[PDB]
């Protein structure tokens, strides 16, 4: 699936506008979206793996990719964890995996979130990366209503060939990223 409406937003609309705000010398400098790594840190369903399956496969509906699990290291006795029973649903997508999901996102996921003024532009950590969290995950296209038995939320992750986040603030937005400013 090497063709979709948001794939060329970058190609034939965001790329040349990125050379305008900075002006580079080499085509392989223009900040490049190319690595989304979603995760679900649910220590909640730690005890039973039953809810765990329903959360991952449900996660597969939005990610559109085979999901995997992260095991824990130390021992949080205080919320009751030891070896590696703990669960975080991780699924890294590149190529056009991300381009099909981020299309459901900025055009169908974000807007349908309960009162969404805009993203939180403080989430730029310094490097050309960015992060955000959510609650209701049913703000997604495929997820229906008679399928959700709990509003377990998540928090995503985005990478770019961007050194300074001032370049990131210009790349994400141009691809249709709604911030609070």
């Amino acid at each position: 699936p090497l063709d979709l409406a948001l794939k060329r937003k970058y190609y034939e609309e965001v790329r040349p506008e990125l050379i305008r705000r900075f002006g580079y010398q080499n085509v392989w400098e223009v900040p490049r979206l190319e690595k989304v790594v979603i995760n679900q840190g649910l220590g909640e369903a730690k005890e039973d793996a039953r809810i765990l399956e329903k959360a991952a496969q449900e996660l597969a509906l939005i990610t559109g990719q085979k999901p995997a699990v992260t095991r824990a290291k130390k021992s949080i006795s205080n919320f009751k964890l030891r070896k590696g029973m703990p669960i975080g649903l991780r699924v890294t997508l590149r190529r056009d995996r991300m381009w099909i999901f981020l299309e459901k996102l900025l055009n169908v996921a974000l807007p349908r979130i309960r009162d969404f003024r805009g993203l939180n532009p403080n989430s730029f950590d310094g490097r050309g990366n960015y992060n955000l969290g959510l609650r209701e995950q049913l703000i997604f296209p495929e997820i229906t209503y008679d399928m959700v038995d709990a509003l377990r939320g998540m928090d995503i992750a985005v990478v770019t060939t961007a050194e300074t986040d001032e370049e990131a603030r210009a790349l994400l937005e141009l691809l249709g990223f709604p911030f609070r400013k």
Binding site: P1, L4, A5, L61, I62, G64, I100, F101, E103, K104, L106, N107, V108, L110, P111, R112, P141, E142
Partner: peptide
């Protein structure tokens, strides 16, 4: 399969994921 997003506010989007029957409610165009 090329899905079909039919939200209340026109804006019928076509992307890629399971079951092209995505009745969205007030998407990005509203």
């Amino acid at each position: 399969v090329p899905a079909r997003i039919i939200c209340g506010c026109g804006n019928v989007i076509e992307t890629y994921s399971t079951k092209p029957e995505i009745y969205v409610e007030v998407c990005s165009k509203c």
